[PDB]
Structure formats: C-alpha cells, structure tokens
Symmetry: C2
C-alpha cells in the first residue's frame, strides 16, 4: 500500500489552510477527488459534450457512450446483475426518495410498519416519515447497544406481519458500525418483505456485492466515493424496480405522451426524468475505477489500520470518549471531550489545519439515544495516513489543555 | 460590436473536428457547450476548494459554502428575483417542475380541478401535472397555438375558469421557438387568484428574464442549456408560494428537528434541497451566467435574432422544406422537415458533413401531433453560432435532399 503515491493523485491534499498543512478528516461528509476524476470531468465538457438521448450526431453519440459506460462501471462496482438495475440520481437522498415515493407510497398504508435502525441518517428516515405523516404508517427503530454493536436478534424481534419494508444502513455514518445486511435480507425475504440498504458510507468503506447481499435496493452517493457532486445511484432488483410507479415525471421516462394520457418507460429510464447528471456520471465512473485500481481490499486493510491506530492514540487522551466501538467498524470516529463543546474543539483544531466536523451529522435520534446533542467526527479515507492520526491526536490533546 | 469570433475562442470544443470534418453544433436546445471559465470554475472547485456545504466550521467547508451561496446570488441577480431565499437548486428543470407539482399541486389540486397548459409544453411540463390527473382526478387543459406557431392571449383567456387551480406554461417553445406573453398571462391568472408556473428552460437561454416584472409564482430553468454544468437546475418561487408548499424530497438539510416520533421542516429554500446538493455544478452555473452577462443579454438577443432571420431566408429557399413555427419574435430554434424524407435520415446524413441537429419528438409529442407529424429535425442556435454555420446547415440540407430524392 503506497499511500504517498496515492496522495500524489489528489491535488488538494498538498494545499495549505491558515498557512498550515491540510489534514482533511471530514471524508464522511464529502471526499476529495483524484486527478483522473477531474480530468474526466474536464475532458467531457471540453471535448465530448452533448445531451444523451443517443442522438444521431457525433457528440451526442460520444456522450451517450461515455454515460452508458459509467452505468456499466457502477454495475461492476456493485456487482449488480444488469446495467438496467442501475438508476442515476442527484444524490443518495434522492435515490431513497425514489423508492419511498415509487414503492412505499402505493404499497404502505395505515398501520403498516417501516423498520429502520436507530443509526439512520436523516435521508433514510424523512422519506419514510412522509408515509407515516401522509398515510398513517408507523416507523419502528431497531436499537444498538452502548458499544455501538448491532444485534440481529433485536432486528428479528421487531419484524411482524405488519412490516412492509425494511430500510437500514450498511455502515453508520457516526459509529462506523457495519450492519449484517445479508443476514437481515435473509430474515426479511423469508417473510416477503423488501429491504432497502443505505450504502452512502458502506460503498466507500466496504466491498459491496448486491447479489450476495440480496437486497432489493442499494443506494450510494458519488461525492463520498471520491467522485463528482451532483450524482447518486439507486440499485434495484429488476422485479422491484418494475413494480414501482414513476417518481419524477417528464422527458425521457415516457413511452407515449398525448393530451389525454401518458404511458411510461421501463426501468431504469422510468426513473430518470429529464437531462441526467451526464458529466457527473462520467466523473463517477472514473472515481470508481480509481478505487478499483488501488484495490478494494487493500483499501479496507489500510482503513482498518487507521481505525485501530486512531482508537489506540485517542484512547490515550484523558477525557475523551468514542461513540461506537464495534470490532468490524469503518474508519469513522465520533468523539467528545468531557466538558468541552464539539464546536469549540472543531473550530480550534481547524486552526492547526485539522478538518473534522461537529454537530448532528444528520443523525439526531442516534445522538439523543446516546445522550448528546453534538459530537466531533473524524472520518478517514484511502489517502489518509497514520501521521494524520497523530496530528489529530496532538491537536485534540492541545485543545483539551486550551479549554481546560 | 458583437465579436462572435472572439466569443467562439472561449469555447474549446468548437474548434474540434468530427468525422475529420469541421464541427457545426446546432443542437443547443438539447444542451449547450461550455465556455472555458465554466470549466475552469468546476476544475478549481474540485482541485482546490472542495468540501460539503452545511457551512462547516473548517476552512474548506467554509470556502465551498461561500462559493455555493455566491452562485445562489448570481442566479438571483440573473433572474432579478427579490431575494436569494426564492432560489432553489435542483438536479434539472424537470425536477424543479416536479417540486412544484408534488409540493403545491398535489395538496391543492383535486377531482375536477383544472390545470391549464399550452400545446407547446415539453414533456417535463406535462407529466408532473398528469400525475395529479391520474392519481387525484384533475383535468388537463391545453391552450392552442395557430398554424404559424403564434400564441393568442384571447385563446388562453377563454380556457380560464372557476375550476382552474394552476397554470403551467412555457416561456419559449423548444420546437417552434414561439415566445409566450407571460406577463399578460400572469396578470389574467392572478386576477382570478390562480398561480402560474413558467417553464423557462429555453426562455432563460434566449431572452432577458425579470421574474418580478413577469410576476410569475414560479420560474424554472436548466443549467446545461445556459452554457453551464450538467446536474444543475433552478426553481424560482415567490417566497409566499414556496412557503405554502409541503416538502418534496425528504432528508438531511431540509429538516429542523428529527425525532423517532416526528419530523419538522426547514423553511424555503432549504426545505426543498434534500441531501448534498450539486455543489460544484451550482458554482459552475454561476460562472456560466456571468459569462452571459459579460457578453450582454441584449447583444445576444440581437445576434440570435439575426441568425434566426438569416436561417429562415436561407432554408426558405430550399424547395421541399417546411419550417414549423414562424412567430415574428421567436427564438432561434428552427424545427423543419423535408417532404418525403425521414428526419432520422436527414440528421444522420448531415452529421457526416459535420452538422449536428436533432431528429425526433423533442420531448413534445402532443405538439407534433397537433402539427401533423411524428418527427422533425431541429437546428437550435446559440450565442457562439454564426451565419457561416447557417450556410453550412443550408448547403448540407440541400445535399441531403438530392441524396434521398
Ligand atoms: Cl455543542
Ligand atoms: Cl422519422
């Protein structure tokens, strides 16, 4: 694992911040981009740009190819059966809404249950809440223990004849806890219940095989996988996509439009209304290829080393608490210093060059359950180093002395 | 004073070859090419100033939030909206229209209520309203246009009634190029308490737009057509009308409080921007709208008017050729057919000569059906196009006619 060589692919990592060395550990919110992604975006706009309704003319063709090729890269990256199971969206949030409006709304009604975890990011909560609020569905929350460990027996107890959908995270964006999703799908499918998986973090930090998982839907977001902003992905099993009605309506998702009626395309196009994020899809392709080039398991090993080393180093800091200590967790470390506000810690180490995030992390119910309103989060990526963990630890010790 | 050769030098793609031949890109109505400044702004954002934008405390989150909030201000100025809080960023114009259709239309339009459109509407300004017809029993009504493509206000006015709950209408037809008299339409609608959505996906590219002088309740446009990034749209809505709308997409950044038991929502515009938005695309859009300001919106209008008139003269001289839409104030969008030849044939063939046009429905089937065709060719002009390109189009079309004849 040549991390120094890897870092050289990311131009931003060498810039200064307040005249100081950048140490970017807010990857969970958004990740930095390798040169190849930037080059792919630039080349698309500069040399191969047009709209993609596979037009007859050269550029429309070249752009449709580049676009369809991304769709294939995503398919391979997730190990989906077919490219027709990959739907492009604005972001993961929109992917989840597509399912919530397309499937959930027609099929989930008064008294029916939607089963989530307490770890869900808001985007895997609010769309389901719409069904509660508008149609009288109930939300149920699978708990997690004080160590952040997820217990399958606790999920299983909350499955019932009224459960119509399971929507659950692959990896917690706060605890880093990895959810045993294959086992969850097995249990759900045995009862005929479909499962959506929020893989916005999972996809960044774990090998993902959506056929081995068996999940009905899997979503992830481009900007976290080292890729462009403005691009998300919804994977859905063909039969499940097919049963969904349209979410957004317009050009490119119809078959026939007359004054009197409209008929709809089949997936994935059924769910991609108007001009899609063309160049962002292409850039995402380049980003997923970048991850393949390094090797997904090499990444996992490297991030596991950063996780363990971070737990050791921060563990040595007197007043510091880590939220989430699952053995197989991703390299996402949420923490607090006793008697100091997270925003204080964060502002201050930013001055040393260290970028962390403080606040809710779009997961308030999780924080309420853990007895806090705010935490700091250092989230690691494939380009981060042990020396950066040390810089974090040094800065946090300094922050503790400053406010203490 | 319009230096088109200098302007063209800002767009790197325009100098490239296609099938060993000079590119003549006339499919701008589908999507426009990008000036270097837009590409530079995108590159710089990713390379040097990238982070998420929940105004984080840390340097990069700050720099990116600034750049992002600055784009929002550029859009506001470009549209002449009252306030930045009236600008909602979306994936594209299509999504902007759906945000209204789901946020306003669905709660407020029911069985028997009427939604008033034009026959010229792009599918994206039809299908979202059809959902209300299909799911809640609303009726769609279509304002016609005459054979020359001219829109007649008296025809819109007759179709207004006590049952009309919303008007959704295009600013400029993506096929005919017809400009709709939107100020007058809003006047008539508002006199009855009826809100108006305007589809400005072409209008914004080709006309000066002042949404306060128009008075429209909503105005949408799309980034990729205004010389900007893909993956970015805009919804403008009068504050009071945005406020009335329930949330469309749900998730991070559009909530106030989330508990297990309930969720409360932000106010506009954030109420309507769920999850990470198209950050760098918004920034790139800003650069694109500044580009248009630099050239001058009225200088553009004069130049595109010259291209329109010259194209009508030149193509008019071609024996078997019919132009669909001849309104006197039309935008520089020319839809046409050659008698006895399929549009796909014409299009594939002139592409070999280097000329890029589009054949097909143009996402406007009802309009084509009302004009008696299934398919047309469309040559759509932009600020960087020239008279010589009109000639190239005309020469290629004459050649195509002889080839298939
Ligand atoms: Cl705090
Ligand atoms: Cl045809």
């Amino acid at each position: 694992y040549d991390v120094e060589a890897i870092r050289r692919d990311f131009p931003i990592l060498s810039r200064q911040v307040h005249g100081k060395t950048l140490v970017y550990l807010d990857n969970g919110a958004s990740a930095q981009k390798p040169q190849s992604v930037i080059d792919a975006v630039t080349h698309a706009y500069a040399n191969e740009y047009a709209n993609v309704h596979r037009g007859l003319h050269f550029l429309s063709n070249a752009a449709t190819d580049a676009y369809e090729k991304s769709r294939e890269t995503v398919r391979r990256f997730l190990n989906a059966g077919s490219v027709d199971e990959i739907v492009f969206t604005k972001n993961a949030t929109e992917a989840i809404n597509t399912v919530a409006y397309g499937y959930g709304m027609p099929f989930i009604g008064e008294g029916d249950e939607i089963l989530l975890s307490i770890m869900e990011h808001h985007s895997n909560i609010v769309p389901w809440h719409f069904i509660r609020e508008r149609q009288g569905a109930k939300l149920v929350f699978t708990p997690v223990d004080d160590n952040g460990v997820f217990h399958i027996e606790e999920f299983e107890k909350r499955l019932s004849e009224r459960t119509k959908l399971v929507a659950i995270t692959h990896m917690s964006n706060t605890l880093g806890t990895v959810v045993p999703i294959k086992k969850i799908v097995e249990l759900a499918h045995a009862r005929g219940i479909p499962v959506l998986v929020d893989g916005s973090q999972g996809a960044v930090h774990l090998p993902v095989d959506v056929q081995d998982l068996g999940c009905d839907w899997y979503v992830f977001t481009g900007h976290k996988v080292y890729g462009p902003s403005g691009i998300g992905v919804l994977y859905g099993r063909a039969q499940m996509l097919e049963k969904m009605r349209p979410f957004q309506g317009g050009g490119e998702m119809i078959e026939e439009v007359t004054e009197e009626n409209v008929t709809y395309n089949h997936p994935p196009h059924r769910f991609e209304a108007g001009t899609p994020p063309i160049v962002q899809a292409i850039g995402l392709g380049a980003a997923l290829e970048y991850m393949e080039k390094i090797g997904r398991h090499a990444i996992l090993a490297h991030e596991a080393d950063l996780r363990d080393y971070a737990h050791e180093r921060l563990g040595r800091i007197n007043s510091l608490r880590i939220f989430g200590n699952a053995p197989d967790k991703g390299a996402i470390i949420s923490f607090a210093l006793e008697g100091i506000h997270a925003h204080d810690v964060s502002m201050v180490i930013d001055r040393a060059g260290v970028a962390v995030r403080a606040g809710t992390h779009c997961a308030q119910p999780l924080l309420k359950r853990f007895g806090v309103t705010s935490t700091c989060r250092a989230s690691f990526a494939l380009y981060n180093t042990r020396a950066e963990v040390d810089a974090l630890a040094e800065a946090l010790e300094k922050a503790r002395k400053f406010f203490g």
